Amino acid sequence: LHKEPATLIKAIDGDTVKLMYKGQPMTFRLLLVDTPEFNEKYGPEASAFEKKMVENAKKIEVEFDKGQRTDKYGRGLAYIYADGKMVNEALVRQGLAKVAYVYKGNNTHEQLERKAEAQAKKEKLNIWSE
Numbered sequence: 001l002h003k004e005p006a007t008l009i010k011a012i013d014g015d016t017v018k019l020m021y022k023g024q025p026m027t028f029r030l031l032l033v034d035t036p037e038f039n040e041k042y043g044p045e046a047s048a049f050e051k052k053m054v055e056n057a058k059k060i061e062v063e064f065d066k067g068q069r070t071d072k073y074g075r076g077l078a079y080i081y082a083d084g085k086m087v088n089e090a091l092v093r094q095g096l097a098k099v100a101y102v103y104k105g106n107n108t109h110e111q112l113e114r115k116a117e118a119q120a121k122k123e124k125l126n127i128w129s130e
């Protein structure tokens with residue numbers, strides 16, 4: 001895969017971020033994860049975590065996978081990195097997102113995400129605490 005630069009416009013919620021990509025605004029939905037909605041338990045915490053990660057980064061990068069690049073809602077589908085750290089993995093490792101929406105055409109980092117999830121579960125973090 002490869003990383004491409006982009007710039008932050010705004011963090012939206014735990015698993016969506018609006019970025020200026022090749023000179024146009026795009027809303028990106030993070031591959032392989034599902035955060036609670038803001039109105040649900042852990043939703044504000046997930047939103048805050050994604051926000052801090054992307055706002056505090058000097059270097060934002062988009063990494064598409066090898067399959068579909070946009071969804072039915074017109075969002076871009078990617079792995080997002082903030083100063084070299086993958087937001088998709090970090091959210092799951094903190095127990096603020098479940099591994100979800102794993103489609104075969106875009107599953108490069110599936111194993112990585114499931115490994116993060118298993119450890120968040122062992123540690124009884126956040127969505128896994130009960």
Ligand SMILES: Cc1cn([C@H]2C[C@H](OP(=O)(O)O)[C@@H](COP(=O)(O)O)O2)c(=O)[nH]c1=O
Binds near residue numbers: 034077101103106
């Ligand atoms: C992450 C992701 C979501 N989606 C779609 C599936 C869901 O469609 P349906 O809602 O129509 O079933 C929706 C979930 O988005 P959110 O979790 O942001 O709600 O986004 C994809 O099509 N591909 C993906 O890779």
Ligand SMILES: [Ca+2]
Binds near residue numbers: 034036
């Ligand atoms: Ca969600």
